[PDB]
Amino acid sequence: RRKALPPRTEKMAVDQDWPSVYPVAAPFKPSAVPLPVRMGYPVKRGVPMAKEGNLELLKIPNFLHLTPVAIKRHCEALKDFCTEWPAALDSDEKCEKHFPIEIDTADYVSAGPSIRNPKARVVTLRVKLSSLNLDDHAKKKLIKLVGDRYCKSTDVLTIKTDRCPLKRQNYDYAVYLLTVLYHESWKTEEWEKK
Amino acid sequence: VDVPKDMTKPEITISDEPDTLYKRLSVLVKGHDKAVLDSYEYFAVLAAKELGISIKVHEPPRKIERFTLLKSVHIFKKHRVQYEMRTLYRCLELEHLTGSTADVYLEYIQRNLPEGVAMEVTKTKLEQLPEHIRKPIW
Amino acid sequence: KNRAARVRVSKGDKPVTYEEAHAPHYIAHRKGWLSLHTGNLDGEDHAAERTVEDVFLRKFMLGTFPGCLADQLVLKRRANQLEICALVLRQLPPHKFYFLVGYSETLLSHFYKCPVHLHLQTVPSKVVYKYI
Amino acid sequence: AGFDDDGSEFHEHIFLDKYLQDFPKQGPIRHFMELVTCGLSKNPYLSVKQKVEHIEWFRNYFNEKRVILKESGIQLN
Amino acid sequence: YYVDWKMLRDVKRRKMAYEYADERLRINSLRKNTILPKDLQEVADEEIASLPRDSCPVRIRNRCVMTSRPRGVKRRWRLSRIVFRHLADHGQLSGVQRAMW
Amino acid sequence: NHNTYFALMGTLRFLGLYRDEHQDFRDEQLRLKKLRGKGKPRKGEGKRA
Amino acid sequence: TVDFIKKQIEEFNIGKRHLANMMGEDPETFTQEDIDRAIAYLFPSGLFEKRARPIMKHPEEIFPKQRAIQWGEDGRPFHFLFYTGKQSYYSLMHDTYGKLLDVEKHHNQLRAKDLLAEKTKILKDPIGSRWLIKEELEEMLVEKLSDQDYAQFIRLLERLSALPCGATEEDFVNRFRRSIPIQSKKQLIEPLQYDEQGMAFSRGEGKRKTAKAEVVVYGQGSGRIDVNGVDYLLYFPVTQDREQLMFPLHFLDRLGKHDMTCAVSGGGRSAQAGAVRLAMARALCSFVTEDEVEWMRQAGLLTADPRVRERKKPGQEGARRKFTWKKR
Amino acid sequence: SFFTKLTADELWKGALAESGAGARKGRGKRTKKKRRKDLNRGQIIGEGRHGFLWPGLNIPLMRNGAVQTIAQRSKEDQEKVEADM
Amino acid sequence: FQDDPYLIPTSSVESHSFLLAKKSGENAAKFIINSYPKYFQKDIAEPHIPCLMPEYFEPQIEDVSEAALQERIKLQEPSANYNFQQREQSEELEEATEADNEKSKTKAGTWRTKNNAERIFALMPEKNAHSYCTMIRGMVKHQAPTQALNLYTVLLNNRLRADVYTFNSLIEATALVVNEKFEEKWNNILDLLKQMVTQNVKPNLQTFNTILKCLRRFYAFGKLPALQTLREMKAIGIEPSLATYHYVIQLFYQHESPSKGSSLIIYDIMNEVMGKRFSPRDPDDDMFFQSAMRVCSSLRDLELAYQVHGLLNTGDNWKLIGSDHRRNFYYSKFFNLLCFMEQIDVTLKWYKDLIPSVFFPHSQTMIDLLQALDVANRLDMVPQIWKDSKEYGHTFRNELKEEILMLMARDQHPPELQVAFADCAADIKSTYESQPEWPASSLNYVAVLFLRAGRTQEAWKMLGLFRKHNKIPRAELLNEFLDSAKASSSPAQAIELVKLASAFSLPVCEGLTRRVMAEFTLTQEQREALGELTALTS
RNA sequence: UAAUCGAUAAACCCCGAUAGACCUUACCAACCCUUGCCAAUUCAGCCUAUAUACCGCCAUCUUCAGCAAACCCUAAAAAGGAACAAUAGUAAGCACAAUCAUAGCACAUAAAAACGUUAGGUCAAGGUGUAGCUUAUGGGUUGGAAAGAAAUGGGCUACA
Ligand SMILES: [Mg+2]
Ligand SMILES: [Mg+2]
Ligand SMILES: [Mg+2]
Ligand SMILES: [Mg+2]
Ligand SMILES: [Mg+2]
Ligand SMILES: [Mg+2]
Ligand SMILES: [Mg+2]
Ligand SMILES: [Mg+2]
Ligand SMILES: [Mg+2]
Ligand SMILES: [Mg+2]
Ligand SMILES: [Mg+2]
Ligand SMILES: [Mg+2]
Ligand SMILES: [Mg+2]
Ligand SMILES: [Mg+2]
Ligand SMILES: [Mg+2]
Ligand SMILES: [Mg+2]
Ligand SMILES: [Mg+2]
Ligand SMILES: [Mg+2]
Ligand SMILES: [Mg+2]
Ligand SMILES: [Mg+2]
Ligand SMILES: [Mg+2]
Ligand SMILES: [Mg+2]
């Protein structure tokens, strides 16, 4: 007892909302898409293959769930979760005066069962030496204390931490190194007099 | 005609802890084909425009990795077959974000990421100054 | 003469599908890849871990759907969950279709420690592109 | 996500000098243990307990092989 | 079963190398330094030699996963040059295509 | 773990959920071989007996 | 297959309405370019062959031209040239010959009456008129054609055009005429720019053998070239490299009349000189009139150099040098 | 050793050697027989060597109005089915 | 369900069977996973999802009695075997080890219960709090509350307080036992309630839920204490769940048949209930919506049927009704009303939204479609509803096709709907003759359909197919077709009509003979008029 | 020598091998185990023979254009099938061509090159029909697999 059903194309409404049809990622089932679309290399006397039984149409990623109307409807519902950016920091010049420390953090995503990526542990710290309270002696000591991690032309000190397994451990290690560098650039020891 | 009523009930609370600030959020979307990356660029730019982020998008140069293998099975080294792997890059450059705004944008961006592409997220976290360095003398 | 991934031309009566009608020198030109994931990108890793699962999925699905598989599987890999798009002939009754889809959606998930989606598209017969 | 590393911090990974107290301070054992500690402190692939066991292994090996250190001509404990 | 007896023995070699990964790492530290006196290093050579043969990582041979081919195998996919082509030409591997330039 | 792969597929073939065409081919060929009369000898009688 | 195409029409129309609903644009203002953009966004297939991409067009655009029914229900064919194999081509040939004979008779009567009122409309050189190729005749006459028959038809059209033309036959021939675009290869001349109180300013870009060069030229300064912050003599110690630099200036007699700054990256010692030569030539177009630009492009300064290094092939040494082939 | 297995079509194509290089000119015909047997002719999907009865494949879904659990045939019933096949 | 049409369910039984087959597949996979755990011990996911790990049904320790019990209680017969093995070596079991063992028996599992219960009290002085939680919950399904009533007194004498779950069961235990007296049993529940507050334990939601659940099966006039305890619940500050209103509505439905005044009480309490977003925190919240729309469907109240439909989607559209057997009844009684109070536009707007999407009608619902179309005289949608009825009600087709075709005889036949009139009749009549009793009423329908369409050729062929079916329709059809034939001037059909009618002796053959005489006079066939008289005389 | 194998005219000779101290390693000499990787199997396992049975993969003619289903014709037909001012040829299809890639065109390069020839190479990538091993042609440990009288192919260094 075989039974063949006409697809949803004959029942699709002209003004039906498409986010209701394709809310999330789908394998592009041809019975749910009333759009007659032909994908494939044509034959000399033939035409490109229709949507039924077409493997090329299934291979490609479908963005039917990301139509502009659906994107509008989704983004409107997300406005309640976001917070407003302060207008007092529109230009970088005041951002450098108020928050001079920059923390470069890397986040990664990959398809598979695994999450752990060894490149995620690296944390970068960038601080401008023109926004600190170093004097001449402590500055000239700090330059030689850091070495090549300070850019003389741009006047930025970079601290790249990898030694800690976790991102938070790398971060608090980096702030500890910044504090220790600041404190040790101030102490004048016996051997500095020679 | 049959539309359900009272469909919305989220759990949103505002904590007293100051929100984290970000200066630049770089997104590097790597893929194999250009059409998927172009459609994703359109989607991401439009979604950022509704949220009011003022994204700037540029395309980093592609990377092609080629290698060479034998053509036959037992003995033929004069004849070879060369295989290619193309990697195309798209740069979504975001500025002037907060911790929660970045979280919601990344939600709507990663939850709908395609299968054949990957993303690299580089956040530039803002911080004024730590505590033992503000104005101390040892 | 090249012979890799090529079905030879008969007297003019063999039915050949679109995937088999194109030589491997047409990949990414006329036909696409049967599997998509991130391990084959440039700065990514874990390619072999996904390749072995890909081969095992091809063989397992071929054995699970005997004689009713029209074309090769389409293995999508998107955020920890892998989707299997299959083209199946309408040889089995829907009662036996629904047993196997539910069986696979849990056996594969428990064997790969990752969510698995299975989508079936039923075709009346094998669709012929070139001569038949 | 899902990996807390026993709630350890950066001082439990970088600073392992607290595990070197029962060793000769002025001997070559300190010269070798400081390189061992520096190598372990730049190791993000291991947890704190594994480094503790690594130090304890050298500990017990050196405390077991006592005749060789006294025969080598250097006073070691 | 496994593909081949050579693969069977290679799996055992890998397992025992992982089992003795820490011990060999600790013994090699006593041999690869100049600070310690040579008198203990000559005994360190003896205990590192007393370990079983298949424990060293040198005996590990990188073969193919499917056909266990000892040579002509790419490291990225752990696949032989023949099975890799057999899969890529069928198109079961993403991003892989014939090079034309 | 090829042992897990092979054992799992064999067990599902025996319980009738996976169908291994290669193993069916091997079984049919071995049955034809044993019917024609050249089978696998018992352990311990091939050489002496 | 007429009913199948008729059903494809309604399916395409309802799909167009649904696509407009999906995109949120007005279906009344929704056009084919919008269909193309919508398909390119919804189905982003990355394939090098554009014909393999998903396409949704009008069925008369997708499907080829189908032959109409050649006979009625009584079996009698409609056209009287059906049994000739190519009814359309032979009808075209018959009509052309009938009009040729009509023109011949009319011109004979006009010559008998001593009336010459026709003109020569055969020369359409300023319009750029050409004859249809076999493909353009095959899309009109749906059945297949032959090269010799196409040549016969063209040669008959020439005979028709070589005669005094009236009103109707000129229009009949005009539908077998195609207009060509202007093959004028004149380049675009960059307008002279004035930047920050500086007169006689222009810029040029050149590229030769993986070497990119930008030249900034001032027409009001003295003759000198500053390459990458240093002098051209220091940057190009080789005489030939400086001869390359003098080649554009000496041709236009602008040696000591222009001050130029060159910035070149990539390539070797001679590749940079060639790229700077090309960029300088492309930049000096603004300071000269039009008649010298053509002399310069005919001397070879305005044409790029596609001579690039060929990729090495497997089994060979230098992409041409093969291995030592032993006969035995 | 599961990845070393192939498709029955590929097995038969090598077993019969219908496309052999020696059979082209006419060197063959010495043993003039080429028979290929389909192994999935009378193979019901749910049946196995263990004799398990699955509600979706072998036995119907519902009996007496109640759901059927996973069953297994007895030793002698399985032998009767084996004799039939 | 899969979206492919070959896998999309067509009827409700097919949907249920497909869901059950899918579930059989999943637990068949789970059986393999549990039976062969070593094939799934390898972990690949870094977060280490625990739901994908295989489960083990074996005890960890076998020799130690104190360790075997705690495994075998949570993992039926093995639980009793563990106790039998533990008591063999004279191992002392505390009041905590055997409490869970007794709970294991109380959950799964008459004569073995007494043997187990003797091991509960005689072997060890166990705590009453762990004794009643097994006993009182066991004998309720064992159908013997008289000994639970004794353990209540034992607990009262042993100075230990009784928890809420004690009175949750004791009131029902004393309520179900009735012998010609119900007032004494109710007074016992009242005495237990008044002791409940004295025993310093607050009466929970489920206590007043059960006291109300007890009152429905005995008295139809017992709603006064039901309303009193309903208000007593609100007086304390506990928001009642859905079943608390459901039992009140059930008894009000029982009293609703003789007097319709209680329907308004149901409506006014429902109006106050539907003012908030609810949460199903009680397992017995499934029957509430069934009762709350059966009350509206019996009394034909769409104005509140809409509000009951709006009540469920306020909190959650799905977490309120458990089984599909009840959701089918839900939608059938909703659309029974919706079809014929409100306008046909609303009926058709909800038809495409409830019928093919959520669930497929039962046999009751399909008749309401016909009754809705007939009252408003809607004919353009009859072929539209029939094509869906073909796929949905094939099981009921043999018993319901008779009433789908009478609507055509009540309305007129416009000259624009002849194709729709022909297609449905052709599809109906071409299937039954290829296999399905054929009633004689459909011939009277096809004749009138083709009369105004002017197609006598197709009308004549189908008439004889039933005359050859060993059964003859009424003579009114024969007269109507005779009028049709004389309109088209076809006297050749009338002779074969009368010859095959008079032989089977129709009751209106006397008028059939007059009509053929008139037709023959009109068409100038008097020779044949006399010839047929000779034939009928012979 | 106790010590692999295959390729070995164009189309082998820095070829399998984008790779040998034990491993790899299939070779040999000494020693050990024989339902011996798997849930089970009068079963596993064999780099045992047959590439002159194969599939999978390639070389060659070959940047040659032909191969070919369904038809039709010849005063018979083994076979052939063309005259453009045209004398029996229509012809789906596979090739070629076109297209695609080397991110703008053109050119060029790459790629592609059908049916078949060489019983061409590969039972040793892998599975395999047939014929053969089963206390051994199977499975483990250790040690060795030289050396050049001599000839030759391909490269590097130079002879300035
Ligand atoms: Mg093998
Ligand atoms: Mg060279
Ligand atoms: Mg050799
Ligand atoms: Mg040889
Ligand atoms: Mg040769
Ligand atoms: Mg050895
Ligand atoms: Mg060796
Ligand atoms: Mg051997
Ligand atoms: Mg050969
Ligand atoms: Mg040709
Ligand atoms: Mg012939
Ligand atoms: Mg042809
Ligand atoms: Mg191009
Ligand atoms: Mg070209
Ligand atoms: Mg080539
Ligand atoms: Mg070509
Ligand atoms: Mg040979
Ligand atoms: Mg050979
Ligand atoms: Mg073999
Ligand atoms: Mg051999
Ligand atoms: Mg030599
Ligand atoms: Mg060579």
What CATH number is attached to the domain comprising E44? 1.10.287.1480
Which amino acid is it at I367? I
- Could you tell me how far CA A183 lies from the centroid of its own chain? 35
Handedness of CA B44, B49, B51, B55 (dihedral sign): positive
Q: Is residue E19 part of a domain?
A: yes
Q: E strands within I116-236?
A: none
Pairing between β-strand H62-63 and β-strand H66-67 as defined by DSSP bridges: antiparallel
Best of A3, A21, A58, A116 to substitute, by most chain I Cβ atoms within 10 angstroms, is: A3
Do residues B85 and E95 lie in contact, with contact meaning Cβ atoms separated by under 8 Å?
A: yes
Structure tokens at I439: 């009633």
- The DSSP code for F5 is H
Q: Parallel, antiparallel, or unpaired for β B63-70 and B118-127?
A: unpaired
Nearest-ligand number for the alpha carbon of E6: 1
User: Is E17 within a domain?
Assistant: yes
Task: Phi first, then psi: give them for residue A61, nearest 5 degrees.
Answer: -75, 135
Nearest chain C Cα to G54, which residue?
C30
CB burial readout G154-185, b (16+ within 10 A) else e: eeebeebbebbbbeebeeebeebeeeeeeeee
Over I473-494, what HEC string results? CCHHHHHHHHHHHHHHCCHHHH
Look at residues C48, A108, A55 and name the one whose alpha carbon lies nearest to residue B117.
A108
Residue A123, beta-bridge partner list: A105, A161
CA–CA dist A144, I172 (Å, integer): 88
Instruction: Look at residue E11 and tell me if it is in a domain.
Output: yes
Task: Identify the three-state secondary structure at position B4.
Answer: coil
Pairing of strands C81-89, C116-123: parallel
**Tokens 């590393």, located at residue:** D5
**How many Cβ atoms sit within 10 Å of the Cβ of residue G288?**
16
**Cβ atoms within 10 Å of G48's Cβ, excluding its own:** 13
CB-based contacts of I268: which residues, under 8 Å, 6+ apart? none
Helix (H, G, I), strand (E, B) or coil at G262: strand
Q: H8, F25: Cβ pair inside 8 Å?
A: yes
Runs of H (alpha helix) within chain A: 18-21, 55-59, 68-77, 92-98, 136-146, 167-184
With CA atoms as reference, report the closest residue to I201 among I151, I139, I129: I129
CB atoms within 10 A of CB G221: 14
Alpha carbon distance B30, I254 (integer Å): 69
Write the DSSP string, I235-282.
Answer: HHTPPP-HHHHHHHHHHHHHHHTT-THHHHHHHHHHHHHTTS-----S
Q: Do residues G34 and G25 lie in contact, with contact meaning Cβ atoms separated by under 8 Å?
A: yes
Instruction: Find the distance separating the first CA and the last CA of chain H, reported in whole Å.
Output: 28
Name residue G214's beta-bridge partners. G205, G263
d(CA A168, CA D13): 13
Tokens of A19: 């986010």
Q: Under DSSP, is residue G308 helix (H, G, I), strand (E, B) or coil?
A: coil
> How are beta strands B21-31 and B118-127 bridged, if at all?
antiparallel
Residues of I in contact with C99 (CB under 8 A): 21-22, 24-25, 28
Residue F27: helix, strand or coil by DSSP?
A: helix
Resolution value in angstroms: 3.4
Give the span between the Cα atoms of G38 and G131, in whole angstroms.
38
Cα(H4)–Cα(F6) distance, integer angstroms: 10
Start-to-end CA span in chain B (Å): 73
Chain I residue nearest residue H68, CA to CA: I24
Say if CB G62 and CB G12 are below 8 A apart: no
The answer to whether the CB of I136 falls within 8 A of the CB of I151 is yes
Contacts of I293 (CB under 8 A, 6+ apart): I305, I308, I330, I333, I334
Which contacts (CB < 8 Å, 24+ apart) does range I350-356 have?
Answer: I350/B1, I350/B2, I351/I385, I352/A11, I353/B1, I353/B2, I354/B2, I355/I388, I355/I392, I356/A11, I356/I388
By CB atoms closer than 10 A (0-12, 13-18, 19+), residue I470 is exposed
Per DSSP, what are the bridge partners of residue A150? A157
Query: Among candidates I143, B130, I191, D63, which has minimal Cα distance to A176?
Result: B130
Q: How far apart are CA G262 and CA G276, in angstroms?
A: 7
For chains E and F, CB pairs below 8 A equal: 7
Nearest residue to nucleotide J152, by CA–C1' distance, is G328
In contact, I24 and H56? CB cutoff 8 Å: yes
Alpha-carbon distance G180 to E56, whole Å?
A: 77
Distance from C-alpha of I184 to C-alpha of I199, rounded to nearest angstrom:
22
Rg (CA), chain G: 32
Contact C92 H45 (CB under 8 A): yes
Separation in Å, CA of D31 to nearest CA in chain I: 39
Provide the 8-state DSSP code for C8: P
Given a contact cutoff of 8 angstroms between Cβ atoms, the answer to whether B39 and G44 are in contact is yes
Are residues A36 and G52, on separate chains, in Cβ contact within 8 Å? Answer: no
Closest partner residue to G63 (CB to CB) among A15, A47, A62 is A47
In three state form, how does the secondary structure of chain D look?
CCCCHHHCCHHHHHCCHHHCCCCCCCCHHHHHHHHHHHHHHCCCCCCHHHHHHHHHHHHHHHHHCHHHHHHCCCCCC
The neighbours of chain A, by the rule of 3 or more Cβ pairs under 8 Å, are B, C, D, G, I
* Phi, psi values for residue I138, rounded to 5°: -85, -50
DSSP lists the bridge partners of residue B124 as A104
Is there a contact between C72 and C19 (Cβ–Cβ < 8 Å)? Answer: yes
Chain I contact for B8 (CB, 8 A cutoff): no
Task: Name the nearest CA neighbour of D29 among D53, D61, D67.
Answer: D61
CA of H20 to the centre of ligand 17 (A): 13
Q: Looking at residue H2, what DSSP letter applies?
A: G
β pairing state of E73-74 and H71-72: unpaired
C-alpha distances (whole Å) from I429 to each of B127, H58, I441 are: 82, 38, 12
In terms of CA atoms, which chain C residue is nearest residue H58? Answer: C96
Grouping H, G, I as helix, E, B as strand and the rest as coil, residue G264 is strand
Look at I52 and C109 and tell me if their CB atoms are within 8 Å. Answer: yes
Give chain J positions with protein CB within 7 A.
Answer: 6-7, 9-26, 34-40, 42-47, 52-61, 68-69, 84-86, 91-95, 99-122, 125-136, 138-142, 153-155
Is the torsion defined by CA of I437, I440, I441, I447 positive or negative?
positive
Residue among G10, G136, G11, G6 at smallest CA distance from G66: G6
Domain that holds residue E79: 1-91
**Nearest to I172, CA basis, from I196, I149, I202:** I149
Evaluate whether residue E12 is within a structural domain.
yes
Q: Which H or E run includes I470?
A: none
Nearest CA to E95 out of G54, C39, G41, C24 is that of: C39
Strand G259-265 with B118-127, pairing:
unpaired
Which DSSP category does I2 fall into? -
Judge A/B contact: 3 or more CB pairs < 8 A: yes
Neighbours of G77 (CB within 10 A): 13
Note whether I342 and I302 are within 8 A (CB).
yes
User: How far is residue I249's CA from residue A143's CA, in Å, rounded to a whole number?
Assistant: 84
* I30 Ramachandran zone, left/alpha/beta (phi>0; psi -120 to 50): alpha
Residue C2 beta carbon within 7 A of nucleic strand J: yes
E100 touches strand J (CB under 7 A): yes
Q: Is the distance between the Cβ of G314 and the closest atom of strand J smaller than 7 Å? A: yes
Nearest to I98 by CA among I78, I79, I77: I79
H-helix or E-strand spanning residue E97: strand E96-98
| Residue H57: both structure tokens together | 């494949």
Written as one string, the DSSP assignment of I301-324 is: -HHHHHHHHHHHHHH-SSTT---H
What amino acid is encoded at E74 in this protein?
A: K
CB contacts, 8 Å: C54 with chain A = none
Contact indicator for G173, G161 with CB cutoff of 8 Å = yes
Q: What are phi and psi of G32, to 5 degrees?
A: -65, -35
CB < 7 A to strand J: residues 55-74, chain B: 61-62, 67-74
Which of chain A's residues 38-57 bind strand J, using a 7 Å CB cutoff?
A: 43-45
H48 touches strand J (CB under 7 A): no
Cβ-Cβ contacts under 8 Å for B9 (sequence gap 6 or more): I277
Which method was it determined by?
Answer: cryo-EM
> What is the DSSP secondary structure assignment for residue I144, as one 8-state letter?
-
Q: DSSP letter at A43?
A: P
**Number of CB pairs < 8 Å for C and G?**
13
Helix (H) or strand (E) holding I10: none
Asked if G45 lies within 8 A of B33 by C-beta distance, the reply is yes
Q: What is the separation, in whole angstroms, between the first and last Cα of chain G?
A: 64
Q: Which amino acid is at G177?
A: R
In 10 A of CB G241, how many CB atoms? 19
Distances (CA, A) of C72 to C54, C101, F18, I2, I407: 12, 17, 18, 20, 53
Beta-bridged to residue B43, according to DSSP, are none
CA–CA separation, C25 and I512 (whole Å): 83
Element (H, E) at H74: none
Report how far residue I175's alpha carbon sits from residue I189's, in angstroms, rounded to the nearest whole number: 8
Which chain B residues are Cβ-neighbours of C116 within 8 angstroms?
none
Q: Report strand pairing: E73-74 vs E79-80.
A: antiparallel
E strands in I86-135: none
Pair of tokens at residue G51 = 């014909």
Torsion angles phi and psi, residue B47, rounded to 5: -60, -40
C-alpha closest to that of G227 among G239, G241, G240:
G241
List CB contacts of G140: < 8 A, sequence separation 6 or more: G132
Q: Which residue type does B15 have?
A: S
CA gap G165, C69 in Å, rounded: 69
Phi, psi of G13 (to 5 degrees): -65, -45
Those residues with Cβ within 8 angstroms of residue G289's Cβ, 6 or more apart along the chain or in another chain: none
| Residue among A32, A54, A31 at smallest CA distance from A41 | A54
Start-to-end CA distance of chain C, whole Å, equals 24
Q: How far apart are CA I96 and CA I243, in angstroms?
A: 34
Distance G7 CA to ligand 1 centre (A): 58
Question: Which among B87, B65, I45, B118 has a CA at the least distance from the CA of C37?
Answer: B118
Q: Which residues of I455-469 are buried (b: 16+ CB within 10 A; e: fewer)?
A: bbeebbebbeebbee
Query: How many structural domains are present in chain E?
Result: 1
The 8-class DSSP code of residue G312 comes to: P
Close Cβ partners of G211 (under 8 Å, ≥ 6 residues apart): G264, G265, G266, G267, G268, G271, G272, G274, G275
Test the A interface: residue of C46, C92, C101 with most A CBs within 10 Å: C46
Q: Is C93 left (phi over 0), alpha (psi -120 to 50) or beta?
A: beta
- As a whole number of angstroms, the distance between CA D44 and CA A161 comes to 11
What burial class does residue I330 get, using C-beta atoms within 10 Å of its C-beta: 0-12 exposed, 13-18 middle, 19+ buried? buried
Q: Rounded to 5 degrees, what angle do the CA atoms A53, A58, A61 make? A: 160
The answer to whether residue E101 sits within a structural domain is no
Single-letter residue type at I172: E
Separation CA D33–CA E35 (nearest Å): 10
Cα separation of G42 and G53, whole Å?
A: 12
CA angle G241, G243, G245 (to 5 degrees): 75
Q: Using CA atoms of I187, I189, I192, I193 in order, give the dihedral in degrees to the nearest 10.
A: -100
Residue-wise over A147-179: b if at least 16 C-beta within 10 A, else e?
eeebeeeeeebbbebebbbbeebbbbbbbbbbe
What's the CA gap between A80 and C92, in Å, rounded? 49
How far apart CA I288 and CA C29 sit, in angstroms, is: 61
Per-residue b/e over F14-42, b at no fewer than 16 CB within 10 Å? ebbbbbbbbbbbeeeeeeeeeeeeeeeee
The subunits that touch chain F, with at least 3 C-beta pairs less than 8 Å apart, are: C, E, H, I
Element housing I143 (H / E): none
Judging contacts by C-beta atoms under 8 Å, the chain E residues touching residue D65 are 40, 43
Estimate in Å the CA E5 to C1' J44 gap, whole number. Answer: 13
Whether residue D10 and residue A169 make contact (CB cut-off 8 A), yes or no, is yes
What 3-state class would DSSP assign to I42?
coil
Nucleotide nearest E70 (Cα, C1')? J24
CA I17 vs CA I28, I324, I326, I368: distances in Å: 16, 12, 16, 27
E9 touches strand J (CB under 7 A): yes
| I227 neighbors I266 (Cβ within 8 angstroms) | no
Nearest Cα to Cα of residue I227 among I199, I204, I255 = I255
Interface contact E2, partner F, CB < 8 A: yes
Cα gap I142→I113, rounded to integer Å: 9
What b-and-e string marks burial along G10-33, b requiring 16 or more CB atoms within 10 Å of the CB?
ebbebbbebbbbbbebeeeebeee
Q: Are A126 and A104 in contact (CB under 8 A)?
A: yes
Q: What is the DSSP string of I30-41?
A: HHHHHH-GGGG-
* Closest by CA position to H4, among listed I197, G304, C59, A193: C59
Interatomic CA distance for residues I213 and I229, integer angstroms: 12
Judge whether A84 and B21 are in contact, CB under 8 Å. Answer: no
Q: How far is I55 from chain C (nearest CA, A)?
A: 11
Cα A139 from Cα A129, distance rounded (Å): 8
